[PDB]
A paper describes a structure:
In A. tumefaciens, the recognition and import of opines is conferred by periplasmic binding proteins (PBPs) and their associated ATP-binding cassette (ABC) transporters; but there is no known structure of the opine-PBP complex. In this work, we investigated the structural and biochemical properties of the PBP NocT of A. tumefaciens C58 which senses at least two opines: nopaline and pyronopaline, a lactam nopaline-derivative that can also be found in plant tumours. NocT possesses a typical fold of cluster F within the PBP structural classification. The ligand-binding site of NocT was defined by the Glu36, Tyr39, Tyr42, Trp77, Ala94, Ala95, Gly97, Arg102, Thr115, Met117, Gln165, Thr168, Ser169, His170, Ser207, Gly238 and Val239 residues.
The two liganded forms adopted a similar closed conformation (RMSD of 0.3 Å for all Cα) while the unliganded form showed an open conformation as commonly reported for the structures of PBPs solved with and without a ligand. The nopaline and pyronopaline bound between the two closed lobes were very well defined in their respective electron density maps. Overall both ligands shared the same protein binding mode for their arginine moiety. The side chain of this moiety was wedged between two aromatic residues (Trp77 and Tyr39) and pointed toward the opening of the cleft by making seven hydrogen bonds with the side chains of Gln165 and Glu36 and the carbonyl of Ala94. Its carboxyl group made a salt-bridge with the side chain of Arg102 and interacted with both NH of Gly97 and Ser169 while its NH group formed a hydrogen bond with the carbonyl of Ala95. Concerning the α-KG parts of both ligands, their first carboxyl group adopted a different position (shift around 1 Å of the two oxygen atoms), but made similar hydrogen bonds with NocT involving the side chains of Tyr39, His170 and Ser207 as well as the NH of Ser207. An additional bond was observed between the Met117 side chain and the nopaline. In the pyronopaline, the hydroxyl of the terminal carbon covalently linked to the N atom interacted with the side chain of Ser169 whereas in the nopaline, each oxygen from the terminal carboxylate group of the α-KG moiety formed two water-mediated interactions with the main chains of Thr115 for one water and with the CO of Phe235 and the S169 side chain for the other water. By intrinsic protein fluorescence titration, the dissociation constant (KD) values between NocT and nopaline and pyronopaline were 3.7±0.6 and 0.57±0.07 µM respectively. Interestingly, nopaline formed with NocT one more polar protein interactions than pyronopaline.
Author numbering: 27 to 285
Write the structure that this text describes.
């Protein structure tokens, strides 16, 4: 049943995991991680780890789990295991409030990508054509990068160490647009600080975006995955995930029972 675990997080992806005024790690991932460990009867310790290297540091045994807004993504499933999802959110585009990209008609509001029908492909092709000549920025090593490189290869993309640097460059006009989850973009654009930023386009799920946010765990740690899965099911069931989601995101992005 374990006694103590070390959970890695990035600390540059608000409101999932970031730093407070005193430099302490805070956010939905921290609050949920602490709640889950309390249910598992395990001592919880959060450590900071750069996004670039967070998966090989887990497999190298530098810590026991990852809670860092990490999507349960098929490429990642080849390397590590995941808990069942603790948050579910679609992906959408981001630009500035004065951008002509905002006027683009969205033919498909909710776009599931596990299977891409010709109709869905025509919508993706439309946005690809509109974005040719638009400078995109994404955080390196994300499903956002994977989507742009696989689904929109003709679009110029710049990759960044952190999403904070993406946002800085979008505000400065060094890039024209970005891509991230609604769970990241809604709290970002809700801030009065970011009235100059707007979400737009289809809300996409599945495909290379994966099956929701999960706890990253080594494949051989089957018992640790079982403990997390039981704790997450209980935290969803009693409304804890919904409560924390409302607190950090300003809305309910918690998953539903029976999957
Ligand atoms: N900088 C970080 N600590 N994490 C970046 C994670 C970005 C992305 N996941 C987050 C969380 C939502 C999800 O994957 O279902 C997002 O899309 O906003 C991903 O797994 O590459
Ligand atoms: Na990754
Ligand atoms: Na919204
Ligand atoms: Na409370
Ligand atoms: Na808030």
């Amino acid at each position: 049943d374990y006694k103590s675990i070390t959970i890695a997080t990035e600390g540059s992806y608000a409101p999932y995991n970031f730093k407070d005024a005193g430099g302490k790690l805070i956010g939905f991932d921290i609050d949920l991680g602490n709640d889950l460990c309390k249910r598992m009867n395990i001592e919880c310790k959060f450590v900071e780890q750069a996004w670039d290297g967070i998966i090989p540091s887990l497999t190298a045994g530098r810590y026991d789990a990852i809670m860092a807004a990490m999507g349960i993504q098929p490429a990642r499933e080849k390397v590590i295991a995941f808990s069942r999802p603790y948050l579910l959110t679609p992906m959408t585009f981001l630009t500035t409030a004065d951008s002509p990209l905002l006027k683009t008609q969205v033919a498909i509001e909710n776009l599931p990508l596990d299977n891409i029908t010709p109709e869905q492909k025509a919508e993706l092709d439309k946005f690809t054509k509109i974005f040719e000549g638009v400078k995109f920025g994404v955080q390196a090593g994300t499903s956002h990068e994977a989507f742009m490189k696989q689904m929109m290869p003709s679009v110029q993309i710049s990759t960044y160490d952190t999403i904070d640097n993406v946002v800085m460059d979008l505000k400065a006009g060094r890039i024209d647009a970005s891509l991230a989850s609604v769970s990241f973009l809604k709290p970002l654009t809700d801030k009065p600080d970011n009235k100059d930023l707007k979400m737009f386009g289809p809300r996409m799920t599945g495909g290379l975006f994966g099956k929701g946010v999960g706890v990253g765990i080594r494949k051989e740690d089957a018992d640790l995955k079982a403990l997390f899965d039981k704790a997450i099911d209980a935290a969803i069931a009693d409304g804890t995930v919904q409560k924390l989601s409302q607190q950090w995101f300003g809305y309910d992005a918690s998953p539903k029972q029976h999957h």
